[model samples]
Target: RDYEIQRERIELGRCIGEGQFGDVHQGIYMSPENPAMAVAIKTCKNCTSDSVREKFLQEALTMRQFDHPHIVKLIGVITENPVWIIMELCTLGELRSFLQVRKFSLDLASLILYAYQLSTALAYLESKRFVHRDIAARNVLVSATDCVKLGDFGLSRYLPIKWMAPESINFRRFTSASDVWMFGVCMWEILMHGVKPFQGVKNNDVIGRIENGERLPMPPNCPPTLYSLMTKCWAYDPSRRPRFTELKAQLSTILEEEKL
Candidate 1:
């Protein structure tokens, strides 16, 4: 509900992103005390109705309410017209592109480090009873200092059929369990250097595979314990999947072992 800004305070620039919501622009926010600064401005395009626009703003509200290192911060939201949601620009951009465009791959420990950070962020969300129904490499942003942050706010049913929990596809039930399931896929993505999940498989086939308890094959050079943890997240029953608390602990232990 904090969205109460006028369009004059913002200056839209290049179109830097296009997500499930709408177009994201690399823009500037004119602050009273200081000069203009870099920001990402987004809106839910084609949402002409008031109800649809409110639903879109609801997602923005959820993100603005939370304050976590791995979760991107919202600068302000202008819901008047052209409905803009502004946030700090992640100069390094999406984590998926960070790996693919830069032609970079993570070492086992480095992969685990980002996993550890992301897991802790999920833990924070769990405490708030907020489910980030969409969790993926493209949904995450990387900072210049190599810090990784999860930033997709929430669900977009229009996303690729990959990286979703069975319950999500079957019932649209989004909970911490579903996020955990997707995080497992996110971990796989980091290890695989950003390959699409269920690649070469049809959407229906992907659903059948997951429904049959078939998880993704391990990425090359995947560490033994990390692979085991991702499989646990793929468990058939929601309750069978480890909570974010447990996943964070597992990541912590793996990190500890690497230090030894």
Candidate 2:
């Protein structure tokens, strides 16, 4: 909360994105100390509202300390009128639309690469006992070179209800285990290539379906190994699910087997 970005340092550009809470703009930061840096400026309306501005300030403060390759870097915060959160501008934008364009045709190795990286990140979060209530393609970012990073703070508690575990979906309970459950949903998202979880299923039907052990059908050309991993993550008992560490190991094995 002590960090504040000087307004003059940020040169605002065209709108790059919009989220549930704010509009993300392309911006440039000029500072002799840090020199010129590329950044995404996320601005939220109703800055005067205690809740709105508070979420911004708090998220930024915590975000700055999150120094990980697979997590988006929060660079600075501007408390000026409209409120701004400056973050690293991922060159390739959101991974969801990227996959959507590919039409569920993503290769196994690529998918594994993404899963492995995200799992490593999740493992880091797990080390901190952090809970990312939401983990999905739309909330992920990819670099032009295919470096995948988790965004939106582990869904930081967002929608697409079908992605959650039974407990989270029913009781709003969030834990590292629940986070693993949601990661399984994200794996499904990548395989489905941008399709929403449980497409065409009604909200009411989902609760019943999940209760009966329903899960997302495997996407076209989804590998057997990945599918098995997906189901493991979707296990009924949250404790039965693999930690990001285990998933990372599995993901590594898959990628290794690919070379042979």
The 0-to-1 C-alpha lDDT of every candidate, in the order given, reads 0.83, 0.82
| Best-fitting candidate, scored by lDDT | 1
RMSD of each: 2.8, 2.5
Highest TM-score: which candidate? 2
> Which lDDT tens digits does candidate 1 get at residues 74-160?
888886667788888888898888877764445567777888999999999898887887788988898653588888775632155
Which segments of candidate 1 are over 4 A away from where they belong?
A: 1-3, 44-48, 154-160
Segments in model 2 whose C-alpha atoms lie over 4 Å from true places? 33-35, 102-106, 154-158
Worst 10 residues of 2 by lDDT: 151-160
**TM-score of model 1 vs. true structure:** 0.88
Tens-digit lDDT track for model 2 on 133-162?
A: 878888889865458998776245315678
Clashes of each: 0, 2
| Residue 118 C-alpha lDDT in model 2 | 91
Error of 1 at 4 (Å): 3.0
